Design a protein around this ligand. Structure first.
Ligand code: HEM
Ligand code: HEM
Ligand SMILES: *[C@@H]1O[C@H](CO)[C@@H](O[C@@H]2O[C@H](CO)[C@@H](O)[C@H](O)[C@H]2NC(C)=O)[C@H](O)[C@H]1NC(C)=O
Ligand SMILES: *[C@@H]1O[C@H](CO)[C@@H](O[C@@H]2O[C@H](CO)[C@@H](O)[C@H](O)[C@H]2NC(C)=O)[C@H](O)[C@H]1NC(C)=O
Ligand SMILES: Cc1cnc(NC(=O)C2=C(O)c3ccccc3S(=O)(=O)N2C)s1
Ligand SMILES: Cc1cnc(NC(=O)C2=C(O)c3ccccc3S(=O)(=O)N2C)s1
Ligand SMILES: CCCCCCCCO[C@@H]1O[C@H](CO)[C@@H](O)[C@H](O)[C@H]1O
Ligand SMILES: *[C@@H]1O[C@H](CO)[C@@H](O)[C@H](O)[C@H]1NC(C)=O
Ligand SMILES: *[C@@H]1O[C@H](CO)[C@@H](O)[C@H](O)[C@H]1NC(C)=O
Ligand SMILES: *[C@@H]1O[C@H](CO)[C@@H](O)[C@H](O)[C@H]1NC(C)=O
Ligand SMILES: *[C@@H]1O[C@H](CO)[C@@H](O)[C@H](O)[C@H]1NC(C)=O
Lengths: 552, 552
């Protein structure tokens, strides 16, 4: 019924109904005009001939390594390239945010209600003839059928970029501070009201939780010493709610910021490392400021760890997955003379694309042992048995799975991969091609072009009929990877701008925050600016074991 | 004890303790260096020798009528000048925000907790020897004494600028959407989580309250007809909580967005006008979009009214209190190529300086009647008796009281003016001169330079002894006003930046919002852009009576 169901507005034009069977396209500031904002202005014609494709740019960043090695060693040259890539990755995100699962038009409710994930593309209206709007059939192909045919893992396909379990678990741990779906409400709702990197997965979402986690001495978090090693406190000791199955003994119910971090020992490992990191910084700050109270030590350390997190995420985590020869740089100063909004809102699509479950192995290898999922899940005994050092050493050695390329979702979490598909439909996601146009990519003209092969393509062809009906979530997982890369084109081009706004949009990056006195002075500022995944592990894990996000 | 108690760091440098009896100034990006950030850098002396004083600028804006009349009728020039005021007023407010009542240093608690008012200056530390830091006596002079001797009104002092009661009530009605102190928590806490122009004073702070106030047909608000006139609904009809003395009959308990608006017929006047305006826009929108449902009609109307509000606030309200001959202009497009943060946090000091109770007359004059405060307060019968048209005609004629210049606070609200003193101290506000310095104003060298006279001046001298202990709030009401103006220098120079952030920081002013489709097309857009206090009253008040913020 709705005349905007076909999404006729192109180039980010906005559709608005003007009657029961007529629409209008607001082409304001798009660089295009006409009934569907398709005919381009003069200056835009120039842009479209001067800008290279993402793949073109990806090739350059992944080749000419000898050249990039020269760039990386000339500070001013490195800063200027980083400056460019920063601002080029910026025009794509609505900030302040716009739509959400309940609002396909901008509303104050959509802007003001922090309980919703935001939305890169508005939902397909409820009164549309087909799930993707007008194209395709009345009902979408069976999620089970999609899942079993092109997503499930036959045999393990290792990531060619060599991502390890330190990478996979860091990904899960890091992202789960802002991907926290409130299932009571629905899939388009979040419990992470910070909408970014606030480290609530360490400190708790609410004040009441943070206080129960706090020692209230020297600014530290409560902790216990098992054997001679520092571990999170228990639920029994702190009364902070954690999600554990009932058969788990009270002495193994470790209590941390995020309620769900008992699920995986790989999560608990990072929670443990970061807990030690917080208290280590507390000692450093106390030594610098013997006049400080508990509250200021706690607050300042938190700001520093927020800083370390952003640093490590950009210069180690994203550095690895990007595969770029260019050496990325965390430096808020690069934005101080640029137009940029120091705020962020977590997009539902960011959450959806970040379901990187194929990363997981069939078994978890920690020294001698090979644990299955059922042995691993909710088992913190394993962390105690092997200790932090063995965990880091083992995780650094174990290869993770490829995400794109299709058929790599471990069977153990098949219900999750299915849920991602159904909840995407439930939230009325537009099609894959709709999202590609929205992030300035050319739409796939066939299923074979998407996969880069033939068997999965034909398998999808018979399910979806039309390529413009292909769904976003299954696509990125089945998408033809870049050469020897973990991710395909759509994954990177969607995830990058979302991620940037997450890290860079943090208030500590704003000019009035990014100064030494914010962070207790020069030594605290130095902690943020010299942080790395290796230093994080080296300062808090006994023996200073080597680590990286890739297999050596 | 705290070595930063004396506020040693100048030019917006940040003080930090480096021990028990030592400190350090963070001069980052201040344009100054040295121990106390006082010796200017080279480029800084230029700026200092090239910028005029606020008084110099105010002079030029309030004189040369003839020249401004030419500028006003050259859209190019007018727009160019507006852009320049817009930016010259936007380097003063910390955005994202920083300090609050509980945090004299930056912390994640102060940033993320939306229940606090933010603070333009950090609070004086608790362990400081004196309320102002180190200057003055152990205890501040009796607030009752300061109240009586320099604040309370002897006889009514009219505003030379000719501000009327339409202005006074508009100031009270408008600002009370973002000045909503949660007295359960303390004076440093707000109930206005939107922290700006969200029109919650019409639609309610929460969803539950909003839905109770809605008619759920044609996007409209609930209302009743008394006589032949449209009034807000009642408490029995909507079940929304209102504040009313127990003797108020049920049929007079009017339910509006702000729970306190039933205490003043003046407030109830604007609540009624704005309620009518919303429903009016619903009629227009439904006509344009017969295919739209109740929800979209309501949300779009709300966005349009927010826009109308900002438009009227800038070009009528602020236009009048400014006294500028230059025609101010509401145009978000003027910021699009500038650096500007589309966000806002309501400062405690903005709240304090906006206590304009001297505006209130001794009696409220509606036609033949002259009501006292007792007769006026919580008396909605007065509104029903006379009607809206007469309210408008009368309040347009009645002069408001001068705010600066001392001794003009009506006795009926002496407890209010005193509370502003007590609560300022309770919130550990820094001194007047500190705030002047903070906002690039030269410190007053004597109590007589502050007041411009001698009797109040000496009166304050015997109370505060040193002018560097003069408190912010009483100073604003006792300050030497600009020539025949309602306000003094300090009032305007603190008020402007805060007010700007509040208005222009609204999300509807962001590039992605400021377009026709956001407001239902060119027609809804046109309602914002042609809005005025006169058209607001003309469209919604029977007989379309003349109105302005100035006595004719
Ligand atoms: C042993 C390892 C893992 C297990 C058992 C697991 C299992 C699950 C389950 C059951 C859910 C749905 C829970 C719910 O919605 O309440 C989920 C969601 C999710 N998973 Fe995993 N997962 C694992 C590893 C990972 C990894 C390595 C990533 C890397 C990015 C990841 C990304 C996500 C994301 C982004 C969500 C959505 C979370 C939300 O919105 O609340 N997971 N996972
Ligand atoms: C008949 C007229 C008025 C009366 C009886 C009145 C009375 C009061 C009272 C009793 C309070 C304290 C409320 C509380 O502590 O809970 C207050 C606060 C305040 N007043 Fe007024 N006032 C009037 C007019 C005005 C006007 C014309 C302005 C112009 C700006 C104004 C500005 C304010 C502000 C900004 C607050 C702080 C509000 C908050 O934080 O909740 N008032 N007034
Ligand atoms: C915003 O800050 C306020 C002030 O601390 C927080 O309020 C307190 O909450 C704790 C329990 O969590 C109570 O014990 C205190 O009495 C509260 N303070 C009061 C009543 O002034 C509030 O929790 C913060 N808001 C959020 C959302 O964290
Ligand atoms: C954000 O929007 C959600 C969705 O409407 C609101 O949740 C509804 O709130 C009402 C109360 O007014 C409840 O009756 C419903 O059960 C809620 N629905 C869902 C799906 O949760 C929520 O109240 C809004 N948040 C704010 C702060 O206004
Ligand atoms: C699946 C993902 C693909 N890409 C990701 N993120 C980036 O590509 C990305 C960042 O996250 C980012 C962070 C800080 C500054 C700049 C960048 S980036 O240029 O957007 N880029 C590498 S996540
Ligand atoms: C007591 C007050 C004194 N001044 C006030 N506000 C202004 O002076 C002011 C605005 O509020 C504002 C609004 C929108 C755009 C620009 C301006 S302003 O230049 O900061 N100015 C007149 S409030
Ligand atoms: C209007 C109510 C006046 C408050 C009563 C206390 C007055 C004490 O104050 C005195 O009042 C006189 C009156 O103008 C002034 O001449 C004095 O300077 C002042 O000190
Ligand atoms: C605009 O889109 C409609 C609907 O998809 C299509 O039928 C029409 O041909 C397009 N018109 C123009 C001028 O591009
Ligand atoms: C949990 O892990 C421990 C590791 O010591 C293992 O012995 C045990 O079998 C596991 N429990 C389950 C239920 O798999
Ligand atoms: C800096 O300020 C302190 C505190 O007011 C003062 O004692 C000191 O003399 C100042 N130092 C300089 C170099 O101005
Ligand atoms: C209420 O207002 C009426 C006029 O409508 C007035 O006569 C009466 O005195 C007022 N009530 C009080 C308690 O002052």
């Amino acid at each position: 019924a709705n005349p905007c169901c076909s999404n006729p507005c192109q180039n980010r034009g906005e559709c608005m109904s003007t009657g029961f069977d007529q629409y209008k396209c607001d082409c304001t500031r798009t660089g295009f005009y006409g009934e569907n904002c398709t005919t381009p202005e003069f200056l835009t014609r120039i842009k479209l001939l001067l800008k290279p494709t993402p793949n073109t740019v990806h090739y350059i960043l992944t080749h000419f390594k000898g050249v990039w090695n020269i760039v990386n060693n000339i500070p001013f040259l490195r800063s200027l390239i980083m400056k460019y890539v920063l601002t080029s990755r910026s025009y794509l995100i609505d900030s302040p945010p716009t739509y959400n699962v309940h609002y396909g038009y901008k509303s104050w409710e959509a802007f003001s209600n922090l309980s919703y994930y935001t939305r890169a593309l508005p939902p397909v209206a409820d009164d549309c003839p087909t799930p993707m709007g007008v194209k395709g059939n009345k009902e979408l192909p069976d999620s089970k059928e999609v899942l079993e045919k092109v997503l499930l893992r036959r045999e393990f396909i290792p990531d060619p970029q060599g991502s390890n379990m330190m990478f996979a678990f860091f990904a899960q741990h890091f992202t789960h501070q802002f991907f926290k779906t409130d299932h009571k409400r629905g899939p388009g709702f979040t419990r992470g009201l910070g909408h970014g990197v606030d480290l609530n997965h360490i400190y708790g979402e609410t004040l009441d939780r943070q206080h129960k986690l706090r020692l209230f001495k020297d600014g530290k978090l409560k902790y216990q010493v098992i054997g001679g090693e520092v571990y999170p406190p228990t639920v029994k000791d702190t009364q902070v709610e954690m999600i554990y199955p009932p058969h788990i003994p009270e002495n193994l119910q470790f209590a941390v910021g995020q309620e769900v971090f008992g699920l995986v020992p790989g999560l608990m490992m990072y929670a443990t490392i970061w807990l030690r990191e917080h208290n280590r910084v507390c000692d450093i700050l106390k030594q610098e400021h013997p006049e400080w109270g508990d509250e200021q030590l706690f607050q300042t350390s938190r700001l520093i760890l927020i800083g370390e997190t952003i640093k490590i995420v950009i210069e180690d985590y994203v550095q690895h997955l990007s595969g770029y020869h260019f050496k990325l740089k965390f430096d808020p100063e690069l934005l101080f003379n640029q137009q940029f909004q120091y705020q962020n809102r977590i997009a539902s699509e960011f959450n959806t694309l970040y379901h990187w479950h194929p990363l997981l192995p069939d078994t978890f290898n920690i020294e001698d042992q090979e644990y299955s999922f059922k042995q691993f899940l909710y088992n913190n005994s394993i962390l105690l048995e092997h200790g932090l050092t063995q965990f880091v050493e083992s995780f650094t050695r174990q290869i993770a799975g490829r995400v794109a390329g299709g058929r790599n979702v471990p069977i153990a979490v098949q219900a999750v991969a299915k849920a991602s598909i159904d909840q995407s439909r439930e939230m009325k996601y537009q099609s894959l091609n709709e999202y590609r146009k929205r992030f300035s990519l050319k739409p796939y003209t066939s299923f074979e072009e998407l996969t880069g092969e033939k068997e999965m393509a034909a398998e999808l062809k018979a399910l979806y009929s039309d390529i413009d009906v292909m769904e976003l979530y299954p696509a990125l997982l089945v998408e033809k990877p870049r050469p020897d890369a973990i991710f395909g084109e759509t994954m990177v081009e969607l995830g990058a701008p979302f991620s940037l706004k997450g890290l860079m949009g943090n208030p500590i990056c704003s000019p009035q925050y990014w100064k030494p006195s914010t962070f207790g002075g020069e030594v605290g500022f130095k902690i943020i600016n010299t942080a790395s995944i290796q230093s994080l592990i080296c300062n808090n894990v006994k023996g200073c074991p080597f680590t990286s996000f890739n297999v050596q």
